[PDB]
Design a binder for this molecule. Sequence first.
Ligand code: FAD
Ligand code: FAD
Ligand code: FAD
Ligand code: FAD
Ligand code: UMP
Ligand code: UMP
Ligand code: UMP
Ligand code: UMP
Lengths: 210, 216, 220, 216
Amino acid sequence: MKIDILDKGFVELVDVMGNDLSAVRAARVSFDEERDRHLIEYLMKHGHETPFEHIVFTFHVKAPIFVARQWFRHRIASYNELSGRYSKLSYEFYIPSPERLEGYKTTIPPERVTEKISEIVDKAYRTYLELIESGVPREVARIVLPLNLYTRAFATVNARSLMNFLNLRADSHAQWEIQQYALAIARIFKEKCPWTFEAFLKYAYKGDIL
Amino acid sequence: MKIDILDKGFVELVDVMGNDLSAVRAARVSFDDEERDRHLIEYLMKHGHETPFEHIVFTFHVKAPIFVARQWFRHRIASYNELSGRYSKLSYEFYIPSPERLEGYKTTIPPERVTEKISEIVDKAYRTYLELIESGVPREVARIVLPLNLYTRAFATVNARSLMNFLNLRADSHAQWEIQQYALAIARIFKEKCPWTFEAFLKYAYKGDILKEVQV
Amino acid sequence: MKIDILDKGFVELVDVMGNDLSAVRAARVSFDMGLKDEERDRHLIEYLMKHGHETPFEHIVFTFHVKAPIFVARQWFRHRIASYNELSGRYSKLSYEFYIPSPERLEGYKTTIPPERVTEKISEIVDKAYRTYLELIESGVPREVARIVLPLNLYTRAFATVNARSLMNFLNLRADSHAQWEIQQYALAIARIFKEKCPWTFEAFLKYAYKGDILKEVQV
Amino acid sequence: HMKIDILDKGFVELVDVMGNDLSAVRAARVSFDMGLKDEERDRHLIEYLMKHGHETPFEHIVFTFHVKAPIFVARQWFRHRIASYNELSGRYSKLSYEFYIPSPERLEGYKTTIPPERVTEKISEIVDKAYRTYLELIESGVPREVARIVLPLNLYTRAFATVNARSLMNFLNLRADSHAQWEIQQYALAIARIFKEKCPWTFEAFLKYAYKGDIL
Ligand SMILES: Cc1cc2nc3c(=O)[nH]c(=O)nc-3n(C[C@H](O)[C@H](O)[C@H](O)COP(=O)(O)OP(=O)(O)OC[C@H]3O[C@@H](n4cnc5c(N)ncnc54)[C@H](O)[C@@H]3O)c2cc1C
Ligand SMILES: Cc1cc2nc3c(=O)[nH]c(=O)nc-3n(C[C@H](O)[C@H](O)[C@H](O)COP(=O)(O)OP(=O)(O)OC[C@H]3O[C@@H](n4cnc5c(N)ncnc54)[C@H](O)[C@@H]3O)c2cc1C
Ligand SMILES: Cc1cc2nc3c(=O)[nH]c(=O)nc-3n(C[C@H](O)[C@H](O)[C@H](O)COP(=O)(O)OP(=O)(O)OC[C@H]3O[C@@H](n4cnc5c(N)ncnc54)[C@H](O)[C@@H]3O)c2cc1C
Ligand SMILES: Cc1cc2nc3c(=O)[nH]c(=O)nc-3n(C[C@H](O)[C@H](O)[C@H](O)COP(=O)(O)OP(=O)(O)OC[C@H]3O[C@@H](n4cnc5c(N)ncnc54)[C@H](O)[C@@H]3O)c2cc1C
Ligand SMILES: O=c1ccn([C@H]2C[C@H](O)[C@@H](COP(=O)(O)O)O2)c(=O)[nH]1
Ligand SMILES: O=c1ccn([C@H]2C[C@H](O)[C@@H](COP(=O)(O)O)O2)c(=O)[nH]1
Ligand SMILES: O=c1ccn([C@H]2C[C@H](O)[C@@H](COP(=O)(O)O)O2)c(=O)[nH]1
Ligand SMILES: O=c1ccn([C@H]2C[C@H](O)[C@@H](COP(=O)(O)O)O2)c(=O)[nH]1
């Protein structure tokens, strides 16, 4: 299960432990679909969130660094990222579509903004390559690369922390770019925990876009 | 997978996400080579790179006396749901130490008498408790007369890194004996589900003294 | 500042870092600003509380000294975003101190035996259990074993260091009628100290963010 | 009140502190049912706790720092999850013309086919062209959160950081170390220096008994 985002990003489901019944078992402390769903909706509406900590996901995420800096602020989660200190860094950058500037009345066409973003990326990356080849250590050379460079990370997160993430990122105050990643997270979450996700939306979800 | 502990306790594995390779994929950042993979497990553990191990997660169902659970729930990087005394009527189950538990200390009465003395008050406390329940005292007030050796039950979800920390501290002769026994059972399950992390852990990172002595 | 709770319990404030302005200072870094103004700083607090920006309140930290029955400590220490150090029954000979509810503890429940009888029966097992504990000790039973006969209403003591965001989560859950009465009492006194040290943050919390019921009814 | 300048334009500034060495003694002492004693006993205890890896008592010493750092430093630093951060937002403010230019001497030990000064120059040029593109996009009405994506990782950011002594010592183990990138090591040197000033006994004990790095 993989969902492409932005121009070259994605979120893939790597692994999941448990399902809706995992929260049910924990809440009951032990080990009829209408009784179990009812308990899920009961916990969600009253803010009993701890039973949801026993459903856990691991995602593999390709995201621009500026999205990843916002993402990694969520501290109740586990991350492992590619090191730019050690990997020769890929020619992969997020270039916004022209549609990204809809509703903004701009001096220069959205199409020239795009072009201006990609030119800097191109000159930054080429300066970076000039630096490597002359023997500047990678850890120094990449400091000239722009914030739209793509990075990759594994994110392991339980469903409670995943719901707090969606409260803050599946919402129109979050930067658009991370909203799109948040939508994808929600979709995988829905697939894997339909009852939890459905109760989340009804009783506890604080954002707007979902 | 279920292991009896003490007189009435147990450690039961409810669930696991991942195995040794889940730490490897996370260190490499790759979704999709035994010798090499094992070599890396060893490498991360040798050089203190412990984050990749946070991507293996266990859920245990644990039954233990409250004095043991209070030591255990002090480990905060973990998720707990415990049987509520406020809401459920509590079962006549109490940890009563073996005389084998005190043999090793010089006492002035036979350990048989320690067993009978402990059993005695458990019995009187529990009766007072039931009398209070029956007479209409809410359970959450009636249970405060119950002694610390009352058995409780919890689901614990914990990643392998935090589990290793748990083992450093609880799988060790400095820890109270009762919880050591629970740690041995946690270790055994860990060893079974992640043999490469476990051996690498014992070789490089483990700070305690029992798991190097006592098999599994 | 020391507030007495229950018959022998207390919440004492050991230390505080920062005050309301700590949070303003922290929030202002986002907009390339420092401290700005004595009344613009208060409004920024309301604003943060109103829109759910909780991170700046992490920069206010308290250390409390708390004496409380184990059954209360057990519920309290469930709050994982905090630091605790507790009196150890493995290494210390525990004192004769136990929470004996007063007869008024049973207001609103029909009982079968009078409330002072309930109080009496609680005292009785407490005195039995503690005698045994002492008999066990005298006999050479190590403390870590002897104490397992002691009841849940035994008082214990702990340091708790906890930031204002986490302490607001604690008030959400514990200064509320769904939480057990005894810990409610403790959450009131915690509320009183938060309020004395962080009055702006505290007023804003009650008005915009607080989910419990009792602090809107019960002064301070 | 303390302030230490790091790199060409960065700093570490102590904003506030809660407690001191005795804060840990006090918290530790509660366990044995004791309190503060003489200077000899209390110093001895701090050393004892550090030797045996009893680190919970150090959680009761707290620091607030105000740090100015290039994003590539702050991105590593922010991986330390047991801490609180508030940072300058590229979403909401006009970012300043401030970037870390490595000095010529940063390249000591590497044979370069371009004199270190020209490296320095090349980094300045690219940074300048980026910042000009950023300003031009802002002036033309491109939203700040978008225009800034062209800015490089050597751009200076600002943050407040609140962190307890235990998590501070973990940060020192990992960043006060030659395996860590030079730039973060420098910030770590600043952090350690202030830690030392405010909690001398703890710091000495940490250095002698628990500190895992090589540069302190
Ligand atoms: C629209 C929006 C604009 C924002 N702008 C800014 C900005 O200007 N500056 C900035 O620095 N960041 C900003 N952020 C980041 C945001 O404030 C948090 O850093 C991020 O959302 C993580 O939230 P969290 O702490 O709830 O999640 P996590 O860190 O994953 O924590 C999860 C939950 O655990 C609790 N918690 C965890 N750790 C602690 C702790 N140490 N103390 C107390 N409670 C804790 C909280 O209840 C929290 O909800 C912004 C976020 C969004 C969505
Ligand atoms: C009225 C009420 C009745 C309850 N009855 C029960 C019961 O029957 N059984 C029982 O076991 N317990 C019960 N509790 C305890 C409850 O389940 C919580 O453990 C406790 O209240 C602490 O709440 P917290 O997790 O919000 O606080 P903390 O554990 O301090 O966490 C605070 C915040 O940090 C975040 N957070 C921290 N760690 C994690 C994590 N690992 N994953 C995701 N998010 C995290 C959350 O956002 C949370 O808001 C009860 C509590 C109350 C108030
Ligand atoms: C033999 C022994 C005797 C002990 N006696 C006492 C006693 O007398 N009194 C007492 O109160 N407790 C005592 N304990 C409990 C002990 O102090 C620890 O709280 C417990 O062992 C869990 O330790 P932890 O913090 O490593 O685990 P967790 O809480 O799971 O934390 C795991 C890891 O996360 C980090 N971490 C998590 N939260 C924080 C934080 N808030 N700040 C900084 N770093 C953090 C640490 O690096 C830690 O190793 C005893 C434990 C043992 C094993
Ligand atoms: C020289 C070096 C090279 C590195 N290269 C890489 C790389 O390629 N990729 C990469 O992603 N990062 C890398 N890092 C970052 C590293 O993986 C950690 O994210 C960072 O060092 C934070 O360490 P920490 O998690 O121990 O500290 P914190 O995250 O603050 O945690 C402090 C302590 O609390 C405990 N703890 C906190 N949260 C949890 C949890 N959820 N589960 C279990 N235990 C917990 C641990 O005991 C930990 O030691 C590198 C770091 C260094 C120093
Ligand atoms: O020494 C390092 C190397 C990597 N990382 C983490 C921080 C980033 O989130 C990610 C990539 O860092 P760079 O290697 O790109 O600096 O890994 C560190 O914290 N320290
Ligand atoms: O109101 C409550 C009820 C329970 N618990 C937690 C504490 C224990 O870990 C467990 C059982 O508590 P009692 O219900 O036995 O008090 O759940 C609370 O934190 N608050
Ligand atoms: O070996 C120990 C000793 C103490 N504690 C913690 C748990 C309780 O919060 C408090 C009291 O524990 P006892 O000494 O009563 O077991 O200290 C432990 O976690 N492990
Ligand atoms: O919507 C936001 C805005 C900011 N931040 C955090 C992430 C960074 O650590 C810091 C600045 O991010 P930017 O505003 O530069 O994205 O604040 C977020 O997490 N989400």
